[PDB]
Amino acid sequence: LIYTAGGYFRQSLSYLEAYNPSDGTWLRLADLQVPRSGLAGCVVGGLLYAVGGRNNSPDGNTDSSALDCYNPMTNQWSPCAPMSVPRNRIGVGVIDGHIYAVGGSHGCIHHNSVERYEPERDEWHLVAPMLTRRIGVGVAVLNRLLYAVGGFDGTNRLNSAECYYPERNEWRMITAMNTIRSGAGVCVLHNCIYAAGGYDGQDQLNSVERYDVATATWTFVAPMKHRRSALGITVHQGRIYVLGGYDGHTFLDSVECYDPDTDTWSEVTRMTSGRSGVGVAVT
């Protein structure tokens, strides 16, 4: 199932919900410990992790360095060791069962820093920083390489992307996307990095493009039906799902599904309520 964690609607949320794309059902599960929006989710060894974000509430706006683990057969959250710094609007990738925490903000500070989490040893350790300061960065894993895509450095919204080589611990800039995208949804489908939606400093976007490593080229595909940034994204059974986000006026509960063989999007459900900035993953 497609799990959605945290998010934001009037305040940061503790929601944990699961969508089943064959029966159209939604399942409510254990509330997050601390409310969170601007976080990212990943699944490592079946379990579900929530990384970074912040608690934007009527009484505070605390950037989070927390990492927390949800077990789908115990329905329980348990805290894991925190990161070195708070990471609001973070991006995460999983290479070889390790969690890479990328970018994000703490207050005014936009991080280029990156750190790796070891689930068998409950430790965080820094790795090499990015070339660029990125918040709202989209992360993907392709051929056990890590891609940081788009985002916001504090001044400019970014179409650039850079690649992290784990066995060399270095970052190389690559071909920039066609579109500037901060808070896009970024994932891997077929063997292309997909970049869906986002914000460019003027408008939310409904366009979608994908990166092919072999040719080092970005090419557009069918646009979503609804402009959105700060969306959740995941691929379930060779199809792309995008969840919620903000269209500049509304918090979307729209869930669109992209079929790569017809290059078609279509709305497959509504979340229980519109929200932005969730973390998403599948298990």
């Binding site: 929006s37 934007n56 901060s182 914000y199 500049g248 918090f251 900035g277």
Partner: peptide, 9 residues
């Protein structure tokens, strides 16, 4: 509001 995420500033 943040133009990108919608959150209150």
């Amino acid at each position: 509001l943040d133009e990108e995420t919608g959150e209150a500033l």
